[PDB]
Design a protein around this ligand. Structure first.
Ligand SMILES: Nc1ncnc2c1ncn2[C@@H]1O[C@H](COP(=O)(O)OP(=O)(O)OP(=O)(O)O)[C@@H](O)[C@H]1O
Ligand SMILES: Nc1ncnc2c1ncn2[C@@H]1O[C@H](COP(=O)(O)OP(=O)(O)OP(=O)(O)O)[C@@H](O)[C@H]1O
Ligand SMILES: [Mg+2]
Ligand SMILES: [Mg+2]
Ligand SMILES: [Mg+2]
Ligand SMILES: [Mg+2]
Length: 347
């Protein structure tokens, strides 16, 4: 039995913990917040700040099989980079790839350098899409309908179409492009639902090439919009993602935690077909169910399993109003929809 140490106990941490459990691994959480979101979901919880008390983490690295950073605190990531040679186990992270992926402008320069289409910068006609250069979860992302308009903000052409995610796990030499998923967006451009998509040869080749040219040793997701004039890559994020890996697990049978672990041990090779519906629903006043995105879920107080039966998993995120994360799967759309209705009827 393997043990994984996660640094970060919010949504990235949940995803990693969830898949580690599916892989039969013990989950050790480190987080500076005494009431970190997934503290009760982990098998062990150690509350400390890794920057303030690095020896505690280094000692933990002697007792676990891998350390996985699952936060986007640049201070933390940069600090871990500075001490990574001192770890007694592998650190499942690509610090160079993250340096590029975290900065949307640097990422776009990277896309351009290898001929990957990406939205036009500073268009002359509305609507414009605007976003910060270094946020996540669509924080600060908004549409602007007139040139009546902020610091180092990205201003792009608004590309209408499906938002599609693809994960790649690299071992430095081989790059495993995994499973396409559809990102369902809400009025805030946050993601409230994920479903799987059939293979797209072009997107897979593009994603392979983005990983290969680094070269990636770690995990990265690639996001593109299938726009009216073709695919446009909007961003990359070289860290363990939330939401999509659960859909990847059920739709493809691939456990991204197992794959990432393999990349830092035995290596990876390049290359199920079920349906899966993954969504978040808030239980509002008078029991009115409301779709919400990650920004809402990340404001919760306690996150863990609520219910399971065949083809149905439900997680409850406690807080001001409860948020349920619902996972449904089956052989096809029809059966999965049937499981969705059963899951909803439970609520
Ligand atoms: N140096 C650190 N040591 C331990 N845990 C950390 C450190 N930096 C961040 N974390 C934890 O990782 C989790 C995710 O952090 P991240 O900064 O990615 O998201 P966030 O929502 O901005 O976090 P916060 O709740 O601090 O605003 C948080 O629970 C946070 O407490
Ligand atoms: N140029 C664009 N045209 C249209 N929609 C866009 C554009 N850029 C971003 N979006 C929308 O905004 C959302 C968030 O943007 P983006 O993924 O670039 O930021 P992020 O917050 O770093 O995302 P992530 O949560 O994946 O870390 C996208 O999923 C998409 O719905
Ligand atoms: Mg992002
Ligand atoms: Mg995906
Ligand atoms: Mg994104
Ligand atoms: Mg990015």
């Amino acid at each position: 039995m393997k043990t994984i140490c996660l640094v970060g106990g919010k949504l990235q941490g949940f995803e990693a913990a969830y898949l580690s459990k599916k892989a039969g691994m013990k989950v050790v959480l480190v987080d500076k917040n005494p009431q970190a979101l997934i503290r009760n979901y982990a098998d062990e919880f150690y509350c400390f700040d890794v920057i303030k008390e690095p020896e505690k983490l280094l000692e933990l690295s002697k007792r676990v099989d891998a350390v996985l950073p699952v936060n986007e605190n640049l201070a933390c990531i940069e600090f871990l980079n500075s001490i990574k040679e001192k770890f007694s186990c592998p650190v499942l992270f690509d610090f160079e790839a993250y340096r590029i992926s975290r900065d949307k402008k640097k990422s776009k320069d990277y896309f351009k350098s290898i001929g990957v289409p990406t939205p036009q910068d500073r268009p002359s006609k509305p609507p414009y899409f605007v976003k910060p250069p270094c946020e996540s979860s669509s924080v600060g992302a908004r549409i602007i309908y007139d040139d009546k308009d902020e610091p180092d903000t990205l201003v792009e052409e608004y590309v209408e179409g499906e938002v599609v995610s693809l994960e790649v796990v690299g071992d430095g030499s081989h790059f495993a492009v995994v499973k396409e998923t559809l990102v369902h967006i809400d009025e805030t451009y946050d993601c409230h639902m994920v479903t799987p998509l059939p293979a797209n040869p072009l997107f897979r080749q593009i994603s392979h090439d983005l990983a290969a040219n680094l070269p990636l040793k770690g995990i990265m997701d690639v996001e593109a919009i299938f726009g009216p004039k073709g695919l446009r890559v909007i961003e990359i994020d070289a860290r363990f993602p939330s939401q999509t890996p659960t859909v990847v697990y059920y739709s493809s049978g691939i456990n991204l935690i197992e794959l990432l672990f393999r990349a830092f041990t035995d290596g990876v090779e390049e290359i199920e077909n079920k349906y899966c519906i993954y969504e978040h629903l808030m239980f509002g006043e008078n029991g009115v169910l409301i779709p919400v995105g990650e920004q809402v879920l990340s404001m919760g107080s306690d996150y863990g399993k609520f219910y399971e039966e065949p083809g149905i998993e439900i997680f409850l995120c406690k807080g001001e109003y409860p948020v349920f994360t619902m996972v449904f799967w089956g052989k096809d759309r029809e059966e999965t929809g049937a499981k969705r209705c059963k899951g909803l009827s439970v609520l």
